[PDB]
Amino acid sequence: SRFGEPLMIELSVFLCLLGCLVCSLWFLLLLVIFSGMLITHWIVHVAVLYFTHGLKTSVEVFIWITVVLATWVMLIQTRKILEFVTWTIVTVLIGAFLWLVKTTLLKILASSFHLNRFFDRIQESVFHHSVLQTLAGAFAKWVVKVYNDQAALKHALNDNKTAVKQLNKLVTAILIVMMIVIWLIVTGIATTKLIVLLSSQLVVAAFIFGNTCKTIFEAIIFVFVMHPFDVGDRCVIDGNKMLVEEMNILTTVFLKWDKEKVYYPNSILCTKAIGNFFRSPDQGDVLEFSVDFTTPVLKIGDLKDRIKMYLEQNLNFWHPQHNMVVKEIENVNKIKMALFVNHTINFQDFAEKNRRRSELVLELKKIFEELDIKYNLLPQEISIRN
Ligand SMILES: CCCCCCCCCCCCCCCC(=O)O
């Protein structure tokens, strides 16, 4: 596991000049320009940071084609051949448009997923590594924590890139297919019988792949929009405290307290209430106990006072705020009580939580012995027959 483990190449400038040289008069000059008009788009782009760098090339294609179609329209059985060509160009532009849309949406999703959530953890990681580099020119525990946190960020970053690439493949594939169909029908190539068969194929597919498409969509919303947890977070699902090992579109992989690896479908996880200790504020806890009904109220008062002193001597573990609650009188034999305390940590480090609680439980033991707090069973009257 990742967590829990024990020459032509640069001839474009020249090519562009050669293309310009192609005409100096007349009507076909725009058509000729199209052959190397990409250079013009590149220059326009130069003339025109995450989105900018990632999208400029998609924009260039879109506008490039737009111009080619516009000049084509204004340029002019060759009669039917040209109708065909015109529509082919239109289809190509539609394709580029959709391409641009697709790219944009994935860039938004991919970026906002992390940029608006853990920017600050990245900066903390950089800081500590700068410090380690400087130092090189409980210390060891600190050093290990710094490396483990960096690894966690690397894993989150890689899983996001992977998930986005998977989305990219699904969308690209459907986009390509629909563009083929669009081309065939707008150009007039497909005939009536072909339209009928394509129509049927789509309808049938709509049923077959219906649940699949819905499931993927819901999984995307769960993972990227709701985002109840990240990689490495300790989460609670139906009472199971589990560490998130990996996130994917269809599944989330978790490690149980005993490090069993669990594959948990997102289509199910989407309907559950999910806890997240990593994202929690300092967490609290409870120690329940019972005392005899005859315990003097003064000993109850001494118990409260002794507990307060303990907690105040250990402020690295406990917040000063606590409550002692008397809850119930059972028969006239038992008083049920509970101690409510506040930890100075959240429970991402579960073992540390238990160690601190364990000491508090032993302190309670000690206080009861010193104050002579006891619990007795009710007496039983016996009658003897011979
Ligand atoms: C149902 C159509 C495909 C869905 C999109 C591609 C896969 C999305 C990611 C899900 C996890 C599959 C890849 C990891 C498999 C493994 O554990 O080796």
Author numbering: 96 to 101, 186 to 204, 222 to 244, 258 to 285, 294 to 354, 503 to 751
List passages from the publication reporting this PDB structure.
A striking difference between the classes is the conformation of the cytosolic TM4-TM5 linker, which can be in an up or down conformation. In the up conformation, the TM4-TM5 linker is parallel to the membrane plane, while in the down conformation, the linker swivels towards the cytosol. TM1-TM5 are displaced in a clockwise manner in the down state compared to the up state when viewed from the extracellular side. In the down state, a short six-residue coil (P96-S101) from the N-terminus interacts near the side portals of the cytoplasmic vestibule. Symmetry expansion followed by variability analysis in cryoSPARC40 confirmed the presence of density for this short peptide only in the down conformation. In the down state, R334 shifts upward and does not contact D598. TM6a hinges away from the pore center in the down state, which displaces F572 outward. Therefore, the distinct TM6 conformations in up and down states could represent different functional states. 3D EM variability analysis displayed a lipid-like density at the top of the pore, which differs from the ‘hook’ and pore lipids of EcMscS, as it is not on the outer side of TM6a or in the middle of the pore, respectively, but rather it intercalates in-between adjacent TM6a helices. This density is associated with the down class, but it only appears when the adjacent subunit (clockwise when viewed from extracellular side) is positioned far enough to create a side opening to the membrane.
Flycatcher1 (FLYC1), a MscS homolog, has recently been identified as a candidate mechanosensitive (MS) ion channel involved in Venus flytrap prey recognition. FLYC1 is an ortholog of prokaryotic MS ion channel MscS (mechanosensitive ion channel of small conductance), which functions as an osmotic release valve, and is perhaps the most extensively studied MS channel. FLYC1 comprises a homoheptamer with six TMs (TM1–TM6) per protomer and intracellular N and C termini. A glycine-containing hinge (G575) splits TM6 into two halves (TM6a and TM6b), and the β-rich C-termini of the FLYC1 protomers come together to form a hollow cytoplasmic cage.
